[PDB]
Enzyme design. Structure first.
Site, PDB file in Angstrom:
ATOM      1  N   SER A   1       0.747  -1.434   0.146  1.00 49.56           N
ATOM      2  CA  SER A   1       0.069  -0.014  -0.001  1.00 49.56           C
ATOM      3  C   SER A   1       0.807   1.356  -0.014  1.00 49.56           C
ATOM      4  O   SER A   1       1.907   1.266   0.306  1.00 49.56           O
ATOM      5  CB  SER A   1      -0.981   0.180   1.355  1.00 49.56           C
ATOM      6  OG  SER A   1      -0.130  -0.055   2.288  1.00 49.56           O
ATOM      7  N   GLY A   2       0.114   2.537  -0.188  1.00 51.38           N
ATOM      8  CA  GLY A   2       0.715   3.764  -0.219  1.00 51.38           C
ATOM      9  C   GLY A   2       1.879   4.022  -0.773  1.00 51.38           C
ATOM     10  O   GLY A   2       2.135   3.577  -2.153  1.00 51.38           O
TER      11      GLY A   2
ATOM     12  N   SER B   1      11.639  10.520   8.280  1.00 52.77           N
ATOM     13  CA  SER B   1      10.355  11.381   8.274  1.00 52.77           C
ATOM     14  C   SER B   1      10.516  12.995   8.576  1.00 52.77           C
ATOM     15  O   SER B   1      11.613  12.981   9.224  1.00 52.77           O
ATOM     16  CB  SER B   1       9.201  10.767   9.076  1.00 52.77           C
ATOM     17  OG  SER B   1       8.234  11.848   9.288  1.00 52.77           O
TER      18      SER B   1
ATOM     19  N   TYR C   1       7.182   8.066  17.437  1.00 50.10           N
ATOM     20  CA  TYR C   1       7.452   8.202  16.249  1.00 50.10           C
ATOM     21  C   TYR C   1       8.473   8.975  15.515  1.00 50.10           C
ATOM     22  O   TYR C   1       9.596   8.592  14.957  1.00 50.10           O
ATOM     23  CB  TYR C   1       6.085   8.420  15.451  1.00 50.10           C
ATOM     24  CG  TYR C   1       6.346   8.486  13.881  1.00 50.10           C
ATOM     25  CD1 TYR C   1       6.043   7.344  13.179  1.00 50.10           C
ATOM     26  CD2 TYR C   1       6.554   9.634  13.193  1.00 50.10           C
ATOM     27  CE1 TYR C   1       6.491   7.287  11.750  1.00 50.10           C
ATOM     28  CE2 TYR C   1       6.613   9.484  11.553  1.00 50.10           C
ATOM     29  CZ  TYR C   1       6.457   8.324  11.075  1.00 50.10           C
ATOM     30  OH  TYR C   1       6.753   8.420   9.716  1.00 50.10           O
TER      31      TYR C   1
END
Lengths: 233, 233, 233, 233
Positions: C16-17, C137, C150
């Site tokens: 996915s994604g 990220s 995270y």
């Protein structure tokens, strides 16, 4: 008790705001201070407020001869420089589209050229073990509308602190940069700043004192953000 | 002359090295210190060296119940915390290839997990305007052979300084990371280090005192490199 | 035309994604791709969409034995791995006060623990001169409310790219982190993003393609922000 | 196959080195290229090697009227700019002690003044959604002996990419900096470079291509290090 006892400090933009707040904190820590700015009336006022252990020198650090006259006064009155805080000049904004050759000249002359020859000319007077502060800015690492030349100049200042850390290491002179955020000096940053307020000249002054003083003795080449977190989150 | 007069501090890894150097400087600055570490014998030797204004608490920061007991002591003895210095732990080296599960857990449990719970659990005692210091490392921005987990772990610490900066701002609590390079603790790092030597633990204590004290009141979320210029040039 | 002709890729989170977008572009670039992910339904769907030159493997990459079964299949079918893109996992949110042991372990297990052992057990299969890609990220350099674990884990991931650059340099294997901002997958980031919008999965796939292909042959240990300018202004 | 089909590129420093390798790659990708440089003899040589789809233009990008003429030519022949890659200039070394006003002027006129007005003047021709590439350097984040002005100016360049990201977002113009390490032009920078070698000019063109193409469509404001790991470990 007195973190700068009998050291000699030279502060450019020593006339007002941050440079003046620093002078005062320096004097409180026991240093002797040369405040170096451009208007005589404002130097006299500054010297009067600081009150003791302070010489006021009128000089424009963008001028080679003014600098020479400066270091001849520092050599004659005190003999040596333990600390150099380079805090000159102000922001002039222009979008990329408005930038004129002369606007670019104004900024770079004051922030880079001036600074280079200021530090160059101080080398003979700088003691081994001394400390040099440059003034960069949050603008150095941000993409702020119409801050084209100011930000580019400040990034270049930050860079000089690395290079000079390398070149001056044989003399054990530490070179570091301070990068202020928004500092109250006679709006929407305060909004995106974690401590939710502009800073006080006095707090910038203390951060500068850290770099100046023996506490930062193993601190070299850094860029010390004093911005209440603006650039950190 | 006393930069932390009447302030209460908690220091984890306060039994030796940097923890203990900082615990001495804090007390010299007038603070009351709780030193926290795993070995009782070591805690006693450390308390005796400090000499005054100290309580030694035996606690393993990777155990939730140990932290509970630390904080109940602190609460009953002093009632608040002004400064939390998180300095527990030591380096363990393994290349990617040699990494085992237990090795991974020893590094992260101490450097990240235990840090998270120490700070979470200090929240109820920390005053507003208090100061929290985390211990990162030059390793967190470097690519050092066989430092896989330790570097990754200390990069995770430098990150929590950023998030806690945002989360804790409503209480005006400052969270900042210090990142030591090579420090003397009973040589190649020193070779490419502009200052040309390892740091003394006292020099690291002095940087932490900066973050702990009001001279850093406009400083939040940062990574303060105390590495003699290692990572800056 | 075919920038990855005959190369072998393994993608984790390939169902996915971003992972799936990247498997499509790598197959259009002429690669043979393994997609690795946890949902059988999801994998067979992705494999139908990709069409040709793909093997789906159901594996939970935080389980050491699933990895073993994974690479045993890669080695049997295709020999060696030219490209390893690690893109497993999703965000979970908790403030410092709300962090539990369980939440912490899910986060660091998926993001840091599994990635280490993923790339670890990939080593005997990676071709010299191959390219390894890590998903860090924007969060990894920011202070995002309730992103505590995270952000810290994605900063740990960025550090591992530097470490493995050094460790694997001998076999000329490149390791780079990609750091996505807000991607569009089935808001306010977009208010502060200069490009004024979320990224498409295809656009993050294109950036990963760059790390994967020869175009980045002199690019190593970097953090490549793909965030429309988010972390850069 | 052809990642720049029918795009118009202008490269300054097009007569050799990176500029020339990039112009070759851009034509290989079906762009129409304008190579801009000081040397007539050098430019006809360069144009001959490219061989097709290229117009040499003779300009000193530090003279405003030279830019007027270059852009009037571009306007007449192609009408539009999709890609502008800024690559004019070379290092000159001087330690702080050795810096003269003339040396300072050479480095900043070419690297910063010239960069500014080149981009300022491309603004009316640049298509919305175009890509503007700047040449910074690993020197922009290092403290290299005798690179005082060159490092400082490259760091200037780096910041201009942030600022122009912000100022140009309304037009969707992406602005990013490339920062080369050691690239082979006509001994130990490579010493602790992870890739164990100087980069090929083709490798840097490929990186620049990444920034000019759609594959970086969600990349804005970045510093892309192409330096075999130098600054990253």
């Amino acid at each position: 008790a007195y973190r700068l006892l009998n050291k000699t400090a030279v502060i450019t933009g020593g006339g007002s705001g941050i440079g003046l707040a620093t002078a005062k904190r320096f004097v409180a820590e026991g240093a002797y201070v040369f405040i170096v700015d451009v208007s005589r009336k404002e130097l006299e006022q500054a010297a009067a407020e600081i009150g003791r252990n302070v010489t006021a020198v009128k000089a424009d650090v963008t001028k080679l001869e003014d600098l020479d006259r400066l270091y001849a006064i520092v050599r004659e009155q005190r003999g040596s420089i333990d600390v150099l805080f380079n805090n000159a000049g102000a922001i002039e904004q222009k979008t990329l589209e408005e930038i004129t050759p002369e606007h670019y000249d104004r900024t770079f002359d004051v922030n880079v050229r001036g600074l280079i020859f200021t530090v160059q000319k101080a080398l003979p007077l700088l003691r081994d073990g001394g400390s040099v502060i440059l003034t960069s800015s949050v603008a150095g690492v941000l993409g702020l509308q119409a801050h084209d030349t100011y930000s580019a100049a400040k990034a270049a200042v930050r860079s000089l602190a690395r290079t000079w850390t390398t070149e001056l290491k044989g003399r054990s002179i530490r070179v570091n940069a301070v990068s202020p955020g928004a500092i109250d000096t006679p709006a929407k940053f305060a909004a995106a700043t974690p401590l939710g307020r502009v800073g006080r000249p006095e707090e910038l002054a203390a951060a500068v004192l850290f770099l100046a003083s023996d506490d930062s003795s193993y601190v070299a080449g850094i860029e010390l953000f004093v911005d209440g977190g603006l650039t950190q989150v």
